[PDB]
Every structure is written in structure tokens, then in C-alpha cells.
Structure 1
Amino acid sequence: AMGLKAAQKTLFPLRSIDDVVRLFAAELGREEPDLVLLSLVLGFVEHFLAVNRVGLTYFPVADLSIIAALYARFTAQIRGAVDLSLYPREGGVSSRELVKKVSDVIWNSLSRSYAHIQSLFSFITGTKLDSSGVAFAVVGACQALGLRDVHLALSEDHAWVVFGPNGEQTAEVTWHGKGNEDRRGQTVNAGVAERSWLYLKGSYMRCDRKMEVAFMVCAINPSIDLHTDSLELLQLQQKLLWLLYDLGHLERYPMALGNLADLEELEPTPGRPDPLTLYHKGIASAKTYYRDEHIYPYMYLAGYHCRNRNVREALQAWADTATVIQDYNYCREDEEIYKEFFEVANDVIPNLLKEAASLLEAGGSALQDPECFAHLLRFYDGICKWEEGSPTPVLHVGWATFLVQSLGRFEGQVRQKVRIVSGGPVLTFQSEKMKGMKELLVATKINSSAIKLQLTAQ
């Protein structure tokens, strides 16, 4: 809420990972965990840990005087720029004018030219924030002002704020991508209606205060450089996510559950569910609360199967990913999920199949399994169907080169044992393009040129 309390101050100084966890455990018992206090603590700790060092053990001590001074600076800056008497508050509901004023206060503070700039620590000490950091700063600013209805909203690649009753009102508060036109102040209604992945068809997350704590924990970046992660930051993020898990605050947060599964893959915690249980809990959350319209729950699971060389389930999970994305329209600012499908289609899957081909060279493999070929076809069907109704095209000559190569990783005998139905394993296509070349996909010899122009047709 507002003002540091003795119950928080007695927990200082923070001298270890477990000290930070204990501060978070106390704040998560409050009805209103202090977003400014917790973000400053995480940003401080991350700032001094995300460096290569000499010294086996090291923890940067979060002295209260330092944290409380930064907290006072944030609060003074917000209370001194936002006069609440000029904005009437009709029974708890903040107005769009007030919410936009706070957004502008944050925005106008940013440095005008410029990793680890996600926290309020970075905001106060260096006037820098990344994109979703701005939207978090706005929610923390509003909590500092008493606006109990202003909350963070998150898709899988963007953030904004919701407010009013039940989060009825939406407002853009930050940028997305690089060269895009500013939409700050506007509603996200256009984004929902265009059926872009960026806005999730309205199936995005609306946080309570405690899901906002989960966000900032997920936002911890342990990366030191391109080769090195901070183990202390990974262990801190992992323990915080278990604390959140235990209190039920990940129940509606699929990406956090995927993140925790990844951390348990890296370093299993004794007595806790295994990664596969956690990946599927993430998928179950997305089905339960978000109409099964999220991509990353299946990308998380696919990556795990891929790393463990469960080729069939990896291709299964990647097809599920395509089955979700087929109902979207590829818009301009959807590039992050495009790059992911590109990498899966034209790098990861070829490598998986090429490794599988080498294994047959010297010995029940997936290249002799028709199910895996079915998964591969459902994956490409979803991406073709995704392209339908989309403004800009998805597939091009490069996709066709690796589709051809991937189909040719299966013996024509093996591919022939899959039944393809239009709109042994049986599979039903949904896209015009895949239906159009259904014949080419089962011939003992693959007309590469023919498939290439059909997959690239208008």
C-alpha cells in the first residue's frame, strides 16, 4: 500500500536469499502487498548479483536505509506530481483521466535515450524501464496513491492496465515492439477485436495485487551475459515461485507455472511435483481460465520433451501449439510468436529429425512412427490455417524448404499409413493449403517443387 511498516522493517537487513523470501512471505499475508517495496528489493538484489565475480559466496546486503530512501523518492515523486483533488473518485473507481495522468508521470520521467531495467530500482536510480516495466511502474504508482482498482493486465507478449469495476476499463500505458505507433491512453478493444495473438482474443490475464507480485518474480532476470546465469537469482526466483504456488497465486498464471517447471528441470526441489506435472498444470490453467487460447503453455511442454529427446510428445505438443494459433490472425505486432514458430519449423524440428535419422543409421525410432508424421502434419496445418484471414502472409519459400526436408525424413511407406481427411492414425486438415497438397504429402516420392508453390500460394 503506502508507507513502510514496522512489520516490514524488522525483517531488514536482507542478508540472504531466504531473508528476501521471508520478506515476500510476510507481504503476501497482507491484503495489499507493497509492490514498490518488493520491486525495489528485487531490483537491488538483481543489480548487484547479475555480475561475474570472484568469491564462492556472495549476497549484496539490502540495508533498510538504502531501500527506504529509494522508496521515499518514488513516493515523493508520485505524490508530488499527482494532485488527487483534481480527480473525483466515484466510489472506488478511478477515472481514465486519473489513470492516464499517472501513466504520463511515469512516462515523462524516463530517460530519452537507451536487460535488468524491469524494476522500480532501475526507474529510481537510472530513469530506465523496459516495456512491461513501465506498466508495472504505473500500477505501483497507483497503489502508492490508493487506487485499489488499478491493476496490471498481461498477455503473452505485452502489458497494460485495467481499472474500474472488475477491470472493465483498459488503458495502454507503454510501448510494444520497435517502430510501432504509440497507443498510450487508448483501450485494448481494437487489439482484442483484430484477433491478434498479442491481445489473446480478450483471454489475457487480469491481476490482483498478489498476481502482480508473481509478475515481478517472473520478471527476475538472472542472465549475467550470453554464457552465464546467476545461480543465486535462479534460486531466489525458484523459491519465490514455490511460495506463490503454495498460496494459490499461480493458479491463474500459466507462464509462471511453465517458468517454475523450467526451474525444477534445472534444479529439482525435494518433495515437489516434477516438471511434467507442472507443465500440465500450466496447460490446465490455460484451459480453465483462458479458454485454451494461450500458446506458451504448449511451447513450454514441447521444449521439455525436445530437450529429453521425447520426439513424439515434442511434435505432439508443437502441433497443439499450432492448433491454438490457427484461430488467430497474424497481425503486425505478433512477431515474437512468429519467430518462435519459424525457429520450431525451420531449425528445431529439422535438427530433431536429422538426429533421429542418424540414430536409424546404427539401430523403434520416431521416423518409422506414423503418429509422429501425423503430429508434423497437424503442426503445418495449424500454421496454414493461422495464415488464413491474416493481413500479412506467414509462409514463404524458406518454410517450404524445410517442410520438404521434414516430410522426406519419413519413409514413403511410413507416411502412407496415415489417413488424411478434409473438412493407423487418422487426421483431419483445416486449412485450404494443406488440403490442397494432401495428395503430395503421401506419395512415395515427394514433388518438392509442387509442394513449394502450394505452401506459398496466395
Structure 2
Amino acid sequence: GLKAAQKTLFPLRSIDDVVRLFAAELGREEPDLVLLSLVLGFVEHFLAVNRVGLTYFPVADLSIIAALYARFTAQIRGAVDLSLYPREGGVSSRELVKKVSDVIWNSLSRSYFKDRAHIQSLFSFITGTKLDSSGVAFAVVGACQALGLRDVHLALSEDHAWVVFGPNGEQTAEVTWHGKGNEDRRGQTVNAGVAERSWLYLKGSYMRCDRKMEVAFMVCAINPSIDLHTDSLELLQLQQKLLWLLYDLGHLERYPMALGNLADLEELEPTPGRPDPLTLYHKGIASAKTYYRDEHIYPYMYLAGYHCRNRNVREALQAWADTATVIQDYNYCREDEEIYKEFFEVANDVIPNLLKEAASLLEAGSQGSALQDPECFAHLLRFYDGICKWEEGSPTPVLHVGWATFLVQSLGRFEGQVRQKVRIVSVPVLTFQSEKMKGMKELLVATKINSSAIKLQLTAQSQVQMK
């Protein structure tokens, strides 16, 4: 609008006032994404970007927010002539979606750091003409809503955002960039990415947001970071309270990562009477299993990270093994690098450091250690098996020798008497899906792991050194 009913809670003088605004907007047929993103961006600006003069909460005066809102709607409605894009029957056209995307795109500063913090909201778009990659996609959806295009919705994978629109909301359109140095595909469908079974498009099991989930997205996009060492407690509390509002309304039901984020927030500062982080992590996994064919990686990464931070090696290993069991049915494609980096860091930094400490604790007499649990060895094996199976049929390889030394080291953290207890069964018991781990089976139980043979098997390296 802004409509009169949207204005009554102003001025927003507190976190709870912002929550009241979100509660009011979420009670409407269409929560106003532009209003809410401007409010979030405003409060984030004065709580994380510039806290000079902050004495409690940056009062969001209606005059300020309405002026920002007016700047956005004036820019969108001036630059997008809906008459050039007749809507068949409550359905938007690819050309109209492309136009809105172009309008947002062409509004941005010609040169800026695209990965900066706090450039995710419409406040950044208006006051700084800067948006990050997913912020452009959100702004396109917000602009489309402002234009009355009820069918245009945010589509979210775990690393990318686009829009769905059109008849039955069945059309997809790229509206922003992805990554760095990647070829722009704005205006195109995501069908090639779905067909190639990349993680980036989740084999089609990506989120198709309704407006409430788009509110959830902007809430998940709140960035409390003031600097590398300091988060705004105010923004953490705001994001946490808004996520609980969304949770209670059912709007995180189909948003696995939001449930992980909420679990993380609860671990940092538990809300009395709320589910434990673990319950929330498993709700995120349940959400992925229920709505997304169990084809999401981050629900298990969230869970694994929790167990890792609590130094719970067994459950961390189980969760990472579960992460790999999801990734195994993907093809590793160009633009999947973010999840490659995650698997790489887990295999080659996080697990080694966990097992290193576990080894020291085992030497100090720990009981029930993951290193003496063959099920934990099996988890480690299943983690690598899923990564190896992921690699099979992929257009780009996953493993290389830079993984092999960490594999040998991690395997060696388990004594042979533990490793021998895992029975690798063909099609603690473990079935390998990957041919690489199948060929590695006999090597996994030697008292002294054959490092060179493991390396050859993991990398499919043909030969050893000539001389």
C-alpha cells in the first residue's frame, strides 16, 4: 500500500514491536514483503551496520519506513509497465518476470562487493543500491508482489534462488546470479540444472515458497553480524523471535534450513518452553524427508555441526554419513562448489580435528569413544562411500589425492580391531554403494592401513611413481 492497517503499529520501538508487525503481516492474505524487508533492513542497519548513537533500539518511525517504501514502489511501478505484459489469467509471463529482474538488476550500483554483509534487504537496495545474489531474487519477488503478481514466488535451493510463476506456478525463471564468475542465466528455466541432477537445483526438490515462506526467507536472511567477532544480540533475538512466530504459524514446515537456523539460535540462547535444538534439527531433517524427497544436504549438516560443536563424534559422524547418503544420488556439477567445499572441509579438516581430539581423549582413558565404536567407523566409511558415489557419473570429479591422506589418517584413528568389526556386505553391517569403497573393503581392516593402496583406490590413480 501502504494500507492504513499496516501503519498502526508504528513507530516500532523494540524487537517485540517488530515481531508484532510481522505477526500482523503474517495474519494478512499476503504479508507485505517490501514493508517487512525494509523494516528488517532498517533495524539491521542501525543494529549491525552503524550503532552510533544506539541507546536501545533504532526506532522505526512510520515517516522513515513509508518514505523508503515509497521509494521502492515508485521505482518499481515507474520502471515496470504492466500494460506491456498482459497477464493471461492471474498468471505472470516470463517476459514480465524478466522485466522485473532487469529493473532490480539495473538499479544496483555498477561495482560493489557482492558478498558484503547486510546487503540482503530492500533497505540496502534503496539506501545503498546494493543487493547480494539471493537478495536480488527476493527483491524481484517483493517487486512482483508490489505489482500485484501473486503467482511470482521465490524458489530456493540450498545455494541459489530463482522464481516460480505462471500457470500452476509451474514455470521457473532465473532472476539473479549465482556464485562468482558463473555465466548468467537470468530468464532461463532451471530445467537443465534439474535434469543434470546437480545439488544446486536439488533434482527439482527445491523450495517453492508461498508468501509466508518468503517472509521466513527474509527472516533467515537477517544478518546479526557486527564484525567477525561480534553479533548484535538484538538482531539474534529478533531473528529468533521471528523464526518462532513463523514456526508457530506453520511456515517453517517446508523450510528445513530455517529449522536448522532456529535450532542454532536456540543452542546459543534457549527460549524457555521451546523444543531443544536437537528436536529442531531433526524436524529440519523430517521436513526435508517429507517435502523434498530427502534430497537436501544442509539439514544433516546442521545436525552434524551441532554434534560437532558439542564434540559428539558418534552423532556428528552419523549425521555427516547421512549427508553423504543424500549427496550420493547427485551428480557433482559446475556451480555445486559450495557443497563441495563443505564436504571437503568436513572430510579434511573437521573430522580430522574431531578424531585427533578423540584420539587424545582415548589415550587419556575415554570410554565409549567413537574410535572404539565400529558403528562410528561404519559412519566414516559411509560418509566416504556417499562422496565416492556422488562422484560416479558426475561431469566433474570430486576426489583427488588431497583427500587421500586425510582418509588414511582418519581410517587410522580407528584401531584394526575396531575396523574389523564392520562387516561390509554386498548387494555392525555396511553396504557400499560406490565402486571405490567396494574396492577398498579388503584394505579397511588391516592393522596398518595400506596408505598407498587406499590412495590408489580413492583416486583411481592408475600408477605409482616410475622410479
Name the TM-score class by shorter chain: over 0.9
Q: CA deviation at 1:366?
A: 1.4
Q: CA deviation at 1:281?
A: 0.7
Q: Deviations over 1:123-170 (max 9, x none)?
A: 111110000000111011111111111110000000001001332111
Q: 1:180 to 1:409 in 2, by over 3 A?
A: same
- In structure 2, the residue corresponding to 1:170 is in which secondary structure? strand
In structure 2, what is the equivalent of residue 30 of structure 1? 28
Q: CA deviation at 1:58?
A: 2.1
Is the deviation greater in 77-86 or in 239-248? 77-86
Q: 1:311 to 1:113 in 2, by over 3 A?
A: same
Q: Deviations over 1:387-406 (max 9, x none)?
A: 01111111111110010001
Distance 2:77 2:375 in 1: 61
In structure 1, what is the equivalent of residue 78 of structure 2? 80
Distance 1:155 1:91 in 2: 28
Q: CA deviation at 1:103?
A: 1.1
Q: CA deviation at 1:57?
A: 4.9
In structure 1, what is the equivalent of residue 56 of structure 2? 58
Q: CA deviation at 1:83?
A: 1.6
Q: Deviations over 1:269-318 (max 9, x none)?
A: 11111111111111111111000000001001111111112211110010
Distance 1:361 1:287 in 2: 39
Q: 1:67 to 1:333 in 2, by over 3 A?
A: same
Alignment partner of 1:408 out of 407, 412, 426: 412
Distance 2:143 2:51 in 1: 34
In structure 2, what is the equivalent of residue 6 of structure 1? 4
Q: Is the 8 A contact 2:46 2:54 kept in 1?
A: no
Q: CA deviation at 1:431?
A: 0.7
Is the deviation greater in 78-87 or in 41-50? 78-87
Distance 1:30 1:281 in 2: 26
Q: Is the 8 A contact 2:325 2:386 kept in 1?
A: yes
Is the deviation greater in 364-373 or in 234-243? 364-373
Q: Deviations over 1:420-449 (max 9, x none)?
A: 123xx0111111111112111111111101
Q: CA deviation at 1:81?
A: 1.3
Q: Deviations over 1:253-283 (max 9, x none)?
A: 1000010000000011111111111111111
Distance 1:52 1:416 in 2: 58
Q: Deviations over 1:213-258 (max 9, x none)?
A: 0000000001111111111000000000000001111111100001
Q: Deviations over 1:171-224 (max 9, x none)?
A: 100000111111011000001001000000000000111110000000000111
Q: CA RMSD in A?
A: 1.6
Q: CA deviation at 1:54?
A: 7.8
- In structure 1, the residue corresponding to 2:69 is in which secondary structure? helix
Q: 1:133 to 1:276 in 2, by over 3 A?
A: same
Distance 1:15 1:205 in 2: 34
Q: Is the 8 A contact 2:320 2:383 kept in 1?
A: yes
- In structure 2, the residue corresponding to 1:53 is in which secondary structure? coil
Q: CA deviation at 1:51?
A: 4.4
- In structure 2, the residue corresponding to 1:228 is in which secondary structure? coil
Distance 2:316 2:45 in 1: 36
Distance 1:419 1:49 in 2: 55
- In structure 1, the residue corresponding to 2:184 is in which secondary structure? coil
Q: CA deviation at 1:86?
A: 1.7
Distance 1:12 1:152 in 2: 28
Distance 2:38 2:402 in 1: 46
- In structure 2, the residue corresponding to 1:224 is in which secondary structure? coil
Aligned sequence identity (%) = 100
Alignment partner of 2:440 out of 418, 431, 437: 437
Q: 1:80 to 1:383 in 2, by over 3 A?
A: same
Alignment partner of 2:241 out of 235, 239, 242: 239
- In structure 2, the residue corresponding to 1:135 is in which secondary structure? helix
Distance 1:89 1:54 in 2: 47
- In structure 2, the residue corresponding to 1:77 is in which secondary structure? helix
Distance 1:353 1:408 in 2: 10
- In structure 2, the residue corresponding to 1:405 is in which secondary structure? helix
Runs of 4+ in 1 over 3 A off after TM superposition: 51-57
Q: Is the 8 A contact 2:332 2:395 kept in 1?
A: yes
Distance 1:287 1:175 in 2: 28
Distance 2:20 2:195 in 1: 43
Q: 1:246 to 1:97 in 2, by over 3 A?
A: same
In structure 1, what is the equivalent of residue 69 of structure 2? 71
Distance 1:56 1:32 in 2: 33
- In structure 1, the residue corresponding to 2:52 is in which secondary structure? coil
Q: Is the 8 A contact 2:49 2:118 kept in 1?
A: no
Distance 1:389 1:272 in 2: 44
Distance 1:85 1:369 in 2: 67
Q: CA deviation at 1:53?
A: 5.2
Report the count of equivalent residues: 454
- In structure 1, the residue corresponding to 2:271 is in which secondary structure? coil
- In structure 2, the residue corresponding to 1:339 is in which secondary structure? helix
Instruction: State the TM-score, normalizing by the size of structure 2.
Output: 0.95
Q: 1:88 to 1:57 in 2, by over 3 A?
A: same
Q: Deviations over 1:23-79 (max 9, x none)?
A: 101000000111110000000000111147588952111111111111111111111
